[PDB]
From a paper:
Carbon monoxide dehydrogenase ([name]) and acetyl-CoA synthase (ACS) play major roles in the global carbon cycle through the consumption of CO and CO2 gases, production of acetate, and breakdown of acetate for methane generation. By contrast, methanogenic archaea employ four copies of [name] (α2ε2 heterotetramers) and eight copies of ACS (β monomers) that interact stably with eight copies of CFeSP (γδ heterodimers) to form a massive 2.2 MDa complex called the acetyl-CoA decarbonylase/synthase (ACDS) complex. ACDS plays a central role in that process, wherein the A-cluster of ACS cleaves acetyl-CoA into CO and a methyl moiety, the C-cluster of [name] oxidizes CO to CO2, and the corrinoid of CFeSP receives the methyl moiety, which is reduced to methane in downstream methanogenic metabolism. Through plunge freezing of the ACDS complex, we captured multiple subcomplexes including a [name] tetramer, a [name]/ACS pentamer, and a [name]/ACS hexamer and characterized these subcomplexes via cryogenic electron microscopy (cryo-EM).
With the next-generation chameleon instrument, different dissociation behavior led to formation of (α2ε2)β and (α2ε2)β2 [name]/ACS subcomplexes in addition to the α2ε2 [name] subcomplexes, allowing us to capture methanogenic [name]/ACS subcomplexes. The use of two plunging methods allowed us to capture two snapshots of MetCODH, with global resolutions of 2.8 and 3.3 Å for the maps from chameleon and Cp3-plunged samples, respectively. The MetCODH α2ε2 heterotetramer shares the same topology as MebCODH and harbors the same set of metallocofactors, including E- and F-clusters, which are not present in monofunctional and acetogenic CODHs. Even in our chameleon-plunged specimen, most of the observed [name] particles did not have ACS bound. In the structures of MetCODH without ACS bound, this CO channel is closed. The structural basis for channel closing appears similar to that previously observed for MoorCODH/ACS. In both cases, helix αA shifts toward helix αB to close the gas channel and block CO release. Instead of Val507(Met)/Val149(Moor), Leu504(Met)/Ile146(Moor), and Phe601(Met)/Phe229(Moor) creating an alcove for bound-CO, these residues now create a choke point in the CO channel. Additionally, helix αA residue Arg500(Met)/Arg142(Moor) has repositioned so that it no longer hydrogen bonds to the A-cluster coordinating Gly279(Met)/Gly596(Moor).
Numbering used by the authors:
A (entry chain A), C (entry chain B): 40 to 801
B (entry chain C), D (entry chain D): 3 to 170
The structure:
C-alpha cells in the first residue's frame, strides 16, 4: 500500500511540523524554579533568563523540565505496554489475531506513526522495540550539555508525546484482545463506583495501581472458588477500570467495585475498611505501609517497579507468608508469582478479616472534640495545604459546635495529609475532616459505564460529516487526573453543561470516576441519563488511562475514513487535517502526573487543543497563540495555493483555566474550526455566546471575527446581532433581505480547503 | 501591619518580593503611569468587590477580570474586560501588545483575589521575561511579585484595603 | 557452556546482591533541595525528612534524584552505542568479526551481565535491545507514585550503573573493531594536547562532542584532499580521543590535536583561534552560537540530539550553505549527511580563515586597564563563582598594576562566565583573566598517550597473582570530568605520587588530558616518563569515556582468567571476588555529569570503591560503612562456612574528599583487601602510613586494625611499630624472636577464602 | 556587624540559618554541653590557625580536622583528630556513635574554614536527619547551618574572631 513521508519518525523527521505548530502557538514558559540543579556545576541561579555554567538559560531549562516530564509519562505507558504484551504472549500466544472490535483500521496511532498494520499479537513487538529505542535517545538528550535551544526541546517533547500515544495504543490493544474486554460496545454494563459502595462486613481486598494481570489472577481464583459473593474486591485508579472490564464482553455487570481516584487512597486506608491492600504499578502512595501498619492492613507488592522495600517471599510457600503476616512479623511482602499471588491475596483477606474488627483511624466523638479543642490557630496547616483550604477557620467553627465547614472541606481535600506534618498540636486534620463528613462518605455511591474501548468504523462514518462540518458542536475529551482545585464536581458540571447542548463527550480515567459520582435531583447519573454511543448528546467511557489513544485514533480515523487520506507514515498531513477541520478539545481539570503531560503533548502534536486546571501551570509550559497579530492566522488553499485567512481558532494548544465556568467558555469557543459551513458555524457561535452570557455576564468581545455570512449568525438572534455589527463595528448590512453586504474580512467559500502544508497543496 | 508575616511553604529561589505597608502600596498605585488591575474570581467576595471597585474608580484603573469574576463588574461603572490569566501573562511579556484597549502595554499590575499557586506561576513568567512591575494587595504573601502584602487574616485584609483606599 | 544464576538481570534479579552491599555500606543522603518539584501537587517542602503529598519523604526523593542521574548517564552511553553500532553495521556490515585485541574474553561486561559471547558485529544488537528495554522500565519507575522506599531506588540505581557499563562496552567494542583503533597496544603513539599546540596561522576546525562518526568523514576528506598539513583540526572532550585513535593501529603519530576539556570550550571560543566549530553530542556548551556570532565563528551541528536551534540544510547544496554562512545570513546549520558534512566543514574553514583575521574577545592592554579600573568591589562575582574564586581581590590587585592574582585564578577557573552575568559594570571577567594569563596559555602544551583500548589476556595472567596477593599495591583508575575544586594539577599530583610508589594507574577521559598537560623540571610528561603497559609503575590511557568499561572488564577478567570463575550471568560472585580480593580504587576528582554518576554506580555494583571531589556531594548520595560497628565486617569462609572477621577495608564505596592530599591518603588506605598475604599487606601498610605521615602529619589512628602478623608490619620500621603495639594497645610481642604472640583480633590464614555469599560456600 | 550581609547565589529552601553577632556566638559556644570544632583546610591560613587554636583552648573543645588541615595542629597543645568530613557528617546522624574519643555523640559543632558548597552539602544531611546544632563562624553565610555569621571580608572576619575570643 501507499506510504507517507514519515514512517518511524525521529526528532529531525518531525521538526518541520513542530516548527509549523510553534510558529502559531508560541511556547509560554512558567518556570517552577529559579535554579537548575541537574549537575554538580550548579545549583545555577537563572533568575532573569540568565544562563547557567553550561550556557543554558531559563527558557531552555524550563523546556528541558517539561521534556523530561513528557518522556517520563511516555516511559510509564510504554513499560506498561511491554509488560502486558510479554505476559499476554507468554500465556495466550503471539499468533493470536487482534480483536479490537468491528473495524478495519485496528491500530490507528500505530499505523499513523510507524506505517504498520499489525494483524496478530507478535506484530506488536517491533513497535515496542522502536518505542524503546526512541525513548533511549530522548532520555539521553536530558544529559547536561546535550541541547541548547528550547524550541528543539519542544520538538522532542512533541515526539515523546506521540510515542506515548503509540505505547498506550499498544497496551490497550493487547489487553482488549487478550482479556476479553468489551469490543467497542455502545452499551457496556454500568458498574458501581464510590467509597460507600463497599460492604465492610465482608473481607475486603483493595487493588491499587494500573497493571491488572495479577488482579486477573486474583479474580480467577475468586471465581473458581465461588468466593465472589463472600468477599469484596475494590480497586483504586485505572486498575479498577481494567478489572471491571475483565471478561465483560458478555455484558453482564461486574462484581468488582471502584473505590475512587488517587485522592481517595489515604482516606480509604484511614477508614479501616480494607483488609488486604495489593499494589501493582504507578499512582500508588508511598506511605501505605506506614499508615497501614497502624491499622494492621497488610500490603502485597506484585511488580518490580514498586517493590516497596518489603521482603521478597516470591518463592516461599503461601501458608508461611500468611502465618508471618498474621503474627505481625512483616507488614507485607513482594509476590512476583501470579498464581501464588492470586491464591494468597484472597486467603490473606479471609484470614485477616476476623483479626481486625473495628480498627480505624476515625476519631471518636469525644476524641474528635478534644482534638478540635487542642488547636491554637497558628495557620501552618493552611500554609501547607496544596488546595489552600481554610483549615483554621473550619477548626475554629468546630470549637463552637459547627461541623459544616469541615464537611465542606472534605470534598475539596485530596487526602494528602501534608497539613498533619506541620501541626504542633499533632491534630490529625484529615481524620478530623473525615469524621465530620462521615455521613456524606457513607452516602458516596454512583454509577459509571465500563470502558468500551475504541470507536468502531460504522459510528465514524455516521458522525464524520456531522463533526467536520460542525453539525455536531464538537468533541469534548474529559480526561486526566484528580488534582482538582475546588472539588470533584467541576468535571460533572462541565460534562452536564456540554451534554445538554448535544456535544460528544468522551471520558476516560479518574475523570470518568468523578463524573459518575454525582446524581441529579431524581437520582440518576449522567451515564444512565445519556446513552453511551459515539454521537451527539452521548457520554462514552473509553476506559483506563491507556484508552486516550482511542480518542486520538478516533480523530485519526475521522480524518482517514471520511476524507479518504492515508494514515501510514502521514503524521503531518493527518494532524493538519485534524487541526483545521475536526472540532475536538480536551480537558484535564486535575492533571498532576507526567503521564498527563505526555498525553496532552501527544494530543497537541495531533492537532487537538487542551484546557487544563489551574494546577497545570506548574508543568512550566503552555502553547498560546497571539490573536492581535494577523500574520499568524494565514494558511494556503489546498486547491491552488493562495493565501487564505482563517479565524483565530483554536487560540491555544495548551492553556490553563482558573474556574470551571471559564473552562466551559474556553471549550465552547475552541471547538470552532475553519472550513465550517454556515449551519455548523451558527451552532458553535450560538453555544459559545450563550455560555459566555450565562457564566461571564457579557457577550464575547471578539465574536464578530468568526462571522463570514448572515447565515453564520445564530438563527434565533440574527437581527439583534446584525444591528450590533451595524452599530459597534460600522458594517454594511442590507436590511431589505437581512444579508451581510460588507464588513467580514474572510469571505465564505464552501469548497475552500485550508491547509498548513505546501507539499501536498496543488 | 502588612509586613510582619511573610512565611512560605516553598520558595521559588533567592529573589523574593518586598513586603510593603498600606502607605507604600498607595503611593505606588497612585504614581503608576499605565496600571492594570488584575482580579481573579476570589474578588467576588462581597467585602472585596466594593473595595476593588472603589480602588479602580479612585484612579481610573482598567480592570482585567481573569477567571469568572467578570459578572461582579457588569453592573458597576468601571472599565473591566475579561481575559484568561495565562494569556494575559503571555501578552504582558510582548512589548508590542496593543493592550486591552489597544493603547499599549502596561508597566504596573495590581493583583487582588488570586489563588497563590496560579498567580505565582503567572508572575514567574511575568517577572523573569518582562519588565512589568507587580503589586500584590491580597491576603497571601506572593513571592514572585515585585511588591506584596504579607500574610493577613480576612479582617486585617479588609482593614488594610480601607487604609489603601483612604490614602488613594 | 555453564551459565550463572543471573543472566539478563532485572531489578528483582539483583536485589539480593544490592541489599548485601547496602548492609555494609549504608547510603548517606545529602539532599541538594529541601523541596520536590516532580508533579503539580508540589512543590512539597520536605525539610526535616517530612513527606510530600504522595507520601514520599526526603530520603526517598534524594534516592530518586540520584537514580534519575544514573539512568540519564546510562541513556547517554547507550544512545552513543546504538548510533555507533547502527552506522558501523550500515557501512562495514554486521558479519564483521569483532577484533578487540589479543584475548579470548572479547566482551567481559557483556558476558558477565547477559551471559553472551558475541563473535560478530550483528550479535551486539540484542544486547542493545535488552539495554533499551531495561532503560525504559527504569525511566518508567521515575514517575510520581512509582516507588516509596529509598533502598529500592538504590537497587535500581545499581542496575542502571551496570547497564551503563554494558552500553559503554558495546560502544567501545564497535568503534575499536570498525574504525581501526589501536588493539590493546602498550606502545600507542603520543599525541599533543593543549590550547597552545594549535597553529593559529592555519584554518582551524574545532570538533566538540563525543561521537566521531561525522568527524571521521571530515578526516577522510582532509586525508584524500592532502589538506592534513594545510589545516588544523583540534577536538575538545572525548571526541578528541576518538579522532586521535582513528586508524592508529599502524602506531604513527596523529595529525589531529587535543585542545582540552569542557572547561576550555569557552576560553578557546573567546580566544578567536577556531575558524569553524562542529558539535556532535553531549558535553557541548549551550552558548556556543551566541559567543561565536560575536567573533564570526560558524557552528555546524551533526546529530539529532544537539540540533542547537539552527536551520536544517541537510539536503541543500554545500556551496549554497557556504555562501549563506559567509554572507552572515545564519550563524551555522545542521548537517545530518556525513559525506556532505565531511566535504563542507573543511571548505567552510578554508573560506572563513581569510575572512576573520585578528578577531578575538581578548581585551587590549588599554581596554584591559579600563575594564579593571571600572570595578567597584561589590562582591557579586565572587558570590556567583562555582569555585568561589576571590575575583574582587584579583581585580583590586590589578588596579594597582599586579596581574599575578588573575594569572593564578586562570587555572582554577572553569570558563563558565557565570561571574559576567552578575557584574553591573559589565566587566568580562573571564576575558580579563585570559588576558592576564595569555603567556601561560601560550605555553600550555603537553603530551598524552592515545587510547590503547582494553587489556589483553597475557598481561592479565602476568599481573593477576601480584594484584590479588597484594604484591602490586593496587590499581588506581583516574577517570571522570574536569570540575576540579582547585585547578587541573591535582590529578597530575595524585598520579605522580602513586606512580612513584609502583601502583598501576589507569586513566581515561578528561582526567588523562589534564594529567598529560604538566611536565617535570626536565620537561617530560608522565606518559613519556613511565611506560604504558598494564603492570606496576605504568600509566595506561584506555581512551574516551566509554573506555571505563575496559577497566571494569579488566577487574572482571582478573577474577575470571586467574581464579578460574565463570563470567556468564555471574554478577554477584564476580563482584564479591572483586570486592574481597582485587585492590582497585577509582578517582573522579572533577565529576559533574550524570555519566560520571552512572559509571561510579556501575563500578560500585562490581565491587570497586571510588573517591570523588568536593563538588560530588551534590550527587546527593554516598555509600559509607560504619567502622565502629563490628557486625558489619563479618563474612563466611568459602571452604566451610564459618564466621570470619575482616578488616574494615574498603571503608566506603562512594566517598568525597576535600583536598588531593586527603584523596591520596584515602586511595592508599582503600587498596587494602582481605586475603592479602604478609608481603602484600606489608607493602600496602607501608604506603598508607608513609602517605599519612607525609600529607596529614600523623600516623593513622586505626593502623593496628590491619595487622594480623609480625610479617604484616613494614620491614623497615618493624621494631618501632612493634614497640608502639606493645605500649599504646598493650599487646604481647616476644622480643626474642620479634614475633606477635597476642593482641591481634583476626588471625592470619593463608588459605582463608572470604566470601559474602553462602550459596556457593561449601 | 556580622549580621548585615546574608546574600546567597542559590537557596536550599525556605528554612535558613539565623545570622548572629559575636556575643551570641560566644554565648552559644560557651554554653555548649559537648561541642566539636570541625575545621577544614581553609583554617591553615596563618591568621585563622592561631584564632582557632585560641578558641579551642579557651573552652577545651575537641577538634575534627577534616581534609588536610591536620598538619597545622600537630605542634600545638590541642586535642585534634583527623576525620573525613563526609564520614563525620554520616557518623553525627547516628545517635549511638561513640565519637572521636568514644564518649558519645556531640550536640553542637562549630564550623570554620570550609568550602561553601561542601560544608553546605554535609550540613544538609546533618540538619535534615539529626538533632545536632551547627554554628558557622566563617566569612561566608551558610544557609544549612543552624546559626551562622554573615558575609564578611577577611579583615572583618579576623576582627569578629577576636571579638568572639574576647567574650570566650
Ligand atoms: S528544579 Fe526542582 S529539584 Fe531542582 S532545585 Fe529546583 S525545585 Fe529543587
Ligand atoms: S546543567 Fe547547566 S544550568 Fe544546570 S546545574 Fe549544570 S551547569 Fe548549571
Ligand atoms: S497547624 Fe494545628 S494548631 Fe496550627 S492552625 Fe492548623 S490545626 Fe491549629
Ligand atoms: S490532607 Fe487535605 S486538608 Fe490536609 S494539606 Fe492535604 S489537601 Fe489540604
Ligand atoms: S512527586 Fe510527591 S513529593 Fe514530589 S511534588 Fe509530587 S506529591 Fe510532592
Ligand atoms: S561584580 Fe563586577 S563590580 Fe562587583 S566586585 Fe565583581 S567585578 Fe567588581
Ligand atoms: S567563569 Fe571562571 S571566574 Fe567566572 S564564575 Fe565561572 S569559574 Fe568563576
Amino acid at each position: 500500500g501507499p506510504m507517507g513521508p514519515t514512517p518511524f519518525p525521529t526528532a529531525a523527521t518531525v521538526r518541520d511540523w513542530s516548527f509549523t505548530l510553534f510558529d502559531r502557538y508560541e511556547p509560554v514558559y512558567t518556570p517552577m524554579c529559579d535554579q537548575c540543579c541537574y549537575c554538580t556545576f550548579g545549583p545555577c541561579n537563572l533568575e532573569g533568563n540568565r544562563r547557567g555554567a553550561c550556557g543554558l538559560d531559563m527558557k531552555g531549562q524550563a523546556a528541558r523540565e517539561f521534556f523530561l516530564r513528557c518522556i517520563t509519562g511516555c516511559a510509564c505507558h510504554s513499560a506498561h505496554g511491554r509488560h502486558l504484551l510479554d505476559h499476554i504472549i507468554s500465556i495466550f500466544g503471539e499468533d493470536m489475531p487482534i480483536n479490537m472490535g468491528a473495524s478495519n483500521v485496528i491500530a490507528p496511532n500505530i499505523q499513523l506513526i510507524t506505517g504498520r498494520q499489525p494483524k496478530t499479537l507478535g506484530d506488536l513487538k517491533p513497535i515496542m522495540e522502536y518505542v524503546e529505542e526512541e525513548l533511549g535517545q530522548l532520555l539521553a538528550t536530558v544529559h547536561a550539555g546535550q541541547e541548547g535551544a528550547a524550541i528543539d526541546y519542544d520538538n522532542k517533547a512533541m515526539l515523546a508525546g506521540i510515542l506515548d500515544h503509540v505505547g498506550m495504543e499498544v497496551s490497550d490493544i493487547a489487553q482488549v484482545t487478550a482479556l476479553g474486554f468489551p469490543k467497542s460496545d455502545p452499551e457496556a454494563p454500568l458498574v458501581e463506583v464510590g467509597m460507600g459502595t463497599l460492604d465492610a462486613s465482608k473481607p475486603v481486598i483493595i487493588a491499587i495501581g494500573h497493571n491488572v494481570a495479577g488482579v486477573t489472577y486474583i479474580m480467577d481464583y475468586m471465581e473458581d472458588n465461588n468466593l465472589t459473593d463472600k468477599m469484596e474486591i475494590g480497586g483504586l485508579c485505572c486498575t479498577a477500570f481494567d478489572m471491571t472490564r475483565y471478561k465483560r464482553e458478555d455484558r453482564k455487570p461486574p462484581y468488582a467495585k471502584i473505590v475512587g481516584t488517587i485522592s481517595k487512597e489515604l482516606k480509604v486506608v484511614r477508614s479501616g475498611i480494607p483488609d488486604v491492600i495489593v499494589i501493582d504499578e504507578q499512582c500508588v502512595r508511598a506511605d501505605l505501609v506506614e499508615e497501614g501498619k497502624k491499622l494492621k492492613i497488610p500490603v502485597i507488592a506484585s511488580n518490580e517497579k514498586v517493590m516497596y522495600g518489603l521482603p521478597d517471599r516470591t518463592n516461599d510457600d503461601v501458608d508461611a507468608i500468611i502465618e508471618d503476616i498474621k503474627t505481625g512479623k512483616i507488614p507485607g511482602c513482594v509476590m512476583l508469582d501470579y498464581e501464588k499471588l492470586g491464591e494468597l491475596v484472597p486467603r490473606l483477606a479471609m484470614e485477616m478479616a476476623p483479626l481486625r474488627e473495628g480498627i480505624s483511624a476515625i476519631p471518636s466523638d469525644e476524641e474528635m472534640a478534644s482534638l478540635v479543642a487542642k488547636c491554637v490557630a497558628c495557620g501552618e496547616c493552611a500554609l501547607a495545604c496544596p488546595e489552600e483550604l481554610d483549615i483554621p477557620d473550619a477548626i475554629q467553627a468546630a470549637k463552637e459546635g459547627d461541623f459544616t465547614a469541615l464537611d465542606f472541606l472534605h470534598d475539596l481535600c485530596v487526602g494528602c495529609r501534608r497539613c498533619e506534618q506541620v501541626c504542633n498540636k499533632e491534630i490529625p486534620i484529615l481524620s478530623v475532616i473525615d469524621k465530620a463528613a462521615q455521613k456524606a462518605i457513607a452516602e458516596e455511591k454512583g454509577l459509571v459505564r465500563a470502558g468500551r474501548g475504541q470507536v468502531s468504523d460504522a459510528e465514524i462514518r455516521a458522525e464524520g460529516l456531522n463533526l467536520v462540518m460542525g453539525t455536531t458542536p464538537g468533541v469534548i475529551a474529559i480526561i486526566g487526573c484528580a488534582n482538582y482545585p475546588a472539588g470533584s464536581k467541576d468535571v460533572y458540571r462541565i460534562a452536564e453543561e456540554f451534554l445538554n447542548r448535544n456535544y460528544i463527550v468522551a471520558v476516560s480515567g479518574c475523570s470518568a470516576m468523578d463524573i459518575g459520582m454525582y446524581k441529579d435531583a431524581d437520582g440518576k447519573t449522567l451515564y444512565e441519563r445519556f446513552p453511551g454511543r459515539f454521537e451527539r448528546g452521548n457520554i462514552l467511557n473509553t476506559g483506563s488511562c491507556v484508552s486516550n489513544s482511542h480518542i486520538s485514533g478516533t480523530c485519526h480515523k475521522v480524518a482517514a475514513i471520511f476524507a479518504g487520506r492515508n494514515l501510514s507514515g502521514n503524521l503531518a498531513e493527518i494532524a493538519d487535517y485534524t487541526l483545521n477541520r475536526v472540532g475536538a478539545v480536551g480537558l484535564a481539570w486535575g492533571a498532576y502526573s507526567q503521564k498527563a503531560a505526555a498525553i496532552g503533548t501527544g494530543c497537541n502534536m495531533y492537532g487537538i487543543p487542551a484546557v487544563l486546571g489551574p494546577h497545570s501551570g506548574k508543568y512550566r509550559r503552555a502553547l498560546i497563540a497571539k490573536t492581535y497579530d494577523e500574520n499568524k492566522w494565514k494558511v494556503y488553499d489546498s486547491r491552488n495555493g493562495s493565501e487564505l485567512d482563517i479565524p483565530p481558532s483554536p487560540e491555544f494548544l495548551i492553556t490553563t483555566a482558573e474556574t470551571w465556568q471559564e473552562a466551559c467558555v474556553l471549550l465552547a469557543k475552541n471547538c470552532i474550526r475553519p472550513s465550517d459551513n454556515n449551519m455548523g458555524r451558527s451552532i458553535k457561535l450560538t453555544h459559545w455566546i450563550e455560555l459566555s452570557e450565562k457564566y461571564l455576564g457579557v457577550l464575547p468581545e471578539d465574536w464578530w471575527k468568526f462571522v463570514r455570512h448572515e447565515a453564520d449568525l445564530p438563527l434565533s438572534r440574527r437581527e439583534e446581532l446584525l444591528k450590533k455589527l451595524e452599530t459597534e463595528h460600522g458594517w454594511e448590512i442590507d436590511w431589505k433581505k437581512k444579508k451581510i453586504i460588507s464588513g467580514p474580512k474572510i469571505k465564505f467559500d464552501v469548497s475552500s480547503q485550508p491547509t498548513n502544508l505546501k507539499r501536498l497543496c496543488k | 501591619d502588612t509586613t510582619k508575616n511573610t512565611k512560605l511553604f516553598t520558595s521559588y529561589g533567592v529573589k523574593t518580593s518586598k513586603a510593603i505597608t498600606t502607605e507604600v502600596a498607595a503611593k505606588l498605585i497612585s504614581k503608576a503611569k499605565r496600571p492594570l488591575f488584575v482580579v481573579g474570581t476570589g474578588v467576588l467576595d462581597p467585602e472585596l468587590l466594593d473595595r476593588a471597585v472603589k480602588i479602580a474608580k479612585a484612579k481610573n484603573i482598567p480592570i482585567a477580570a481573569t477567571g469568572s469574576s467578570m459578572p461582579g463588574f457588569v453592573d458597576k461603572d468601571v472599565n473591566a474586560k475579561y481575559i484568561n490569566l495565562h494569556q494575559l501573562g503571555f501578552y504582558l511579556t510582548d512589548p508590542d501588545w496593543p493592550g486591552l484597549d489597544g493603547n499599549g502595554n502596561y508597566d504596573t499590575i495590581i493583583l487582588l483575589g488570586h489563588k497563590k499557586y496560579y498567580i505565582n506561576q503567572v508572575l514567574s513568567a511575568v517577572k523573569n521575561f518582562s519588565d512589568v512591575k507587580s503589586i500584590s494587595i491580597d491576603r497571601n504573601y506572593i513571592q514572585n511579585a515585585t511588591m506584596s502584602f504579607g500574610n493577613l487574616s480576612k479582617a486585617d485584609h479588609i482593614a488594610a484595603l480601607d487604609e489603601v483606599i483612604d490614602l488613594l
